[PDB]
Amino acid sequence: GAMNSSNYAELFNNDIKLFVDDTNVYRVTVHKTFEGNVATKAINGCIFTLNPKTGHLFLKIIHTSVWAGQKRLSQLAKWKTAEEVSALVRSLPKEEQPKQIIVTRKAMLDPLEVHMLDFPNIAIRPTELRLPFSAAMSIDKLSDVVMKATEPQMVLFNIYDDWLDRISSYTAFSRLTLLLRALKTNEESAKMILLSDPTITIKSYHLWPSFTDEQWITIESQMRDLILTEYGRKYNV
Amino acid sequence: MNTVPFTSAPIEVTIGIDQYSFNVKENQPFHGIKDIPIGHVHVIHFQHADNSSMRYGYWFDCRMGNFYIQYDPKDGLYKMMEERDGAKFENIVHNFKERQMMVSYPKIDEDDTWYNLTEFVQMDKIRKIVRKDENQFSYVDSSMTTVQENELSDPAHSLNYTVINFKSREAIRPGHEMEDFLDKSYYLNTVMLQGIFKNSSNYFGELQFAFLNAMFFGNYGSSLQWHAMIELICSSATVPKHMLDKLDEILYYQIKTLPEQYSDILLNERVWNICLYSSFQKNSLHNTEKIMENKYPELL
Numbered sequence: 457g458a459m460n461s462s463n464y465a466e467l468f469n470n471d472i473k474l475f476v477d478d479t480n481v482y483r484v485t486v487h488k489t490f491e492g493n494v495a496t497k498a499i500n501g502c503i504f505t506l507n508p509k510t511g512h513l514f515l516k517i518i519h520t521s522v523w524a525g526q527k528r529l530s531q532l533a534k535w536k537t538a539e540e541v542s543a544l545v546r547s548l549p550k551e552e553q554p555k556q557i558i559v560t561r562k563a564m565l566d567p568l569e570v571h572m573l574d575f576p577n578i579a580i581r582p583t584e585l586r587l588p589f590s591a592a593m594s595i596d597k598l599s600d601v602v603m604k605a606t607e608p609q610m611v612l613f614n615i616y617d618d619w620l621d622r623i624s625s626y627t628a629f630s631r632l633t634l635l636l637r638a639l640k641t642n643e644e645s646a647k648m649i650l651l652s653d654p655t656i657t658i659k660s661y662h663l664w665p666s667f668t669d670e671q672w673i674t675i676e677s678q679m680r681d682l683i684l685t686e687y688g689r690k691y692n693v
Numbered sequence: 694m695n696t697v698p699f700t701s702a703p704i705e706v707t708i709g710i711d712q713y714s715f716n717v718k719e720n721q722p723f724h725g726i727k728d729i730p731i732g733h734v735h736v737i738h739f740q741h742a743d744n745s746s747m748r749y750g751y752w753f754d755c756r757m758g759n760f761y762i763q764y765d766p767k768d769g770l771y772k773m774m775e776e777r778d779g780a781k782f783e784n785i786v787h788n789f790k791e792r793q794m795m796v797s798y799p800k801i802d803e804d805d806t807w808y809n810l811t812e813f814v815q816m817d818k819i820r821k822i823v824r825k826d827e828n829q830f831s832y833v834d835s836s837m838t839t840v841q842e843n844e845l846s847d848p849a850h851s852l853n854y855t856v857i858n859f860k861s862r863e864a865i866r867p868g869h870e871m872e873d874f875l876d877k878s879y880y881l882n883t884v885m886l887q888g889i890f891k892n893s894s895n896y897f898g899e900l901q902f903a904f905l906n907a908m909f910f911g912n913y914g915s916s917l918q919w920h921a922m923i924e925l926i927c928s929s930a931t932v933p934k935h936m937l938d939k940l941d942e943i944l945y946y947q948i949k950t951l952p953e954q955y956s957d958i959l960l961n962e963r964v965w966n967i968c969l970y971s972s973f974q975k976n977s978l979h980n981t982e983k984i985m986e987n988k989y990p991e992l993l
Binding site: 532535538539566567569570571573574 | 860861862865870871874
């Protein structure tokens with residue numbers, strides 16, 4: 457059934473599962489035409505498919521060409537998400553295929569479900585959690601690879617860098633979602649927080665700075681303060 | 694004009710025949726229903742005064758044999774039976790009429806209701822949904838489950854309706870996932886019409902038989918089956934014009950006939966709003982839409 461705070465630790469057991477988020481699949485800029493009407497221009501997007509236990513990210517880049525000559529693109533985007541996820545599952549060896557797929561937006565259930573009819577023992581689940589995976593294009597390395605792509609492309613990342621060498625999946629996921637939550641509420645500050653110190657660099661093969669353990673605490677605390685502040689400002693509390 | 698005699702009426706029971714019904718008192722001298730119009734299926738059903746649960750009933754066609762009702766005190770129900778002795782049967786029937794112990798099937802001559810509700814229903818198809826091939830008539834009751842219900846326990850008592858599932862391989866061609874799920878024309882016309890049902894009349898027949906079982910016995914999975922079959926049509930972009938026109942007539946008389954006090958369980962809000970207002974065929978059910986709005990605007 458639906459995933460929520462009650463059954464939260466299930467994400468870290470040894471049943472293979474993937475989150476799928478489709479928020480950046482179909483991305484537009486909105487602009488005015490010469491005659492003054494509004495028109496959109498699509499840019500490249502990505503499917504964000506992530507195993508929360510291992511950190512493995514299957515970034516499927518959605519090239520603007522996909523939309524060429526199509527109607528109802530926002531509807532088509534859910535089906536294209538589900539086509540690509542299904543093909544990913546198929547491309548995986550049997551023992552690697554997920555037992556569950558958890559979609560971050562309920563509107564994905566029917567498309568994926570239909571696309572997955574060949575995998576009746578793969579359970580397709582919604583979630584009640586308000587996960588921040590939309591801010592995945594706030595990670596400079598992910599946004600760069602997406603915006604540069606000239607054809608459909610799959611890119612593999614570990615979204616946890618090398619954290620799991622030192623912390624659990626549970627703690628690794630809580631950091632990720634805290635980082636992304638801050639990037640989502642206030643990207644400029646969030647990114648300021650991460651890069652202020654020029655002496656802490658991002659490894660070529662990583663997404664995030666190589667903070668020591670103690671520096672991560674200060675970062676996580678700085679990200680927490682960011683999020684709480686933005687809340688009082690939103691609501692005047 | 695045909696007759697269905699009753700041996701006796703030992704228990705207080707409300708008897709129905711088609712859309713008509715009569716209260717009969719414990720050991721009231723009631724002995725049958727006469728002047729039943731030949732040429733249509735019929736259903737004679739029952740609801741004991743003491744157990745307003747379990748409505749039950751027998752579908753039949755008088756051209757297929759001479760049938761009668763006999764209360765069984767072991768099993769506690771009015772049973773339908775066939776008399777093979779033709780002579781012995783006209784004798785019972787003629788003598789009960791002479792004594793005038795039979796109600797007349799009360800058909801108004803202006804009234805095409807029963808015809809309209811059974812237009813496509815054929816006894817031969819009823820007996821494939823309710824498999825019990827030693828009898829020529831068919832028993833249904835409130836509690837019988839359908840083959841699709843059973844998949845999600847006793848198959849001898851199942852309603853073997855045609856299974857319709859919008860999220861199945863049957864319904865969805867590979868490579869046409871999004872097309873076939875948003876537009877069920879493939880499933881409707883190739884899989885169901887041409888494939889399984891062979892023609893539209895067998896389709897409407899089951900559709901109608903499912904409605905009638907929902908209405909007369911409150912059989913919940915028959916209701917489910919009626920909604921499914923409506924939805925598949927309404928959710929197909931390409932439907933023969935003759936089917937759309939007939940469907941508007943079929944639903945009209947079904948909505949027209951439903952007890953007003955029952956619209957809440959027998960009518961699925963989602964399906965009806967989708968068919969009448971969202972679906973490809975929103976504009977094709979003008980009579981069914983006019984009558985729904987003027988009678989159950991709440992549901993909508």
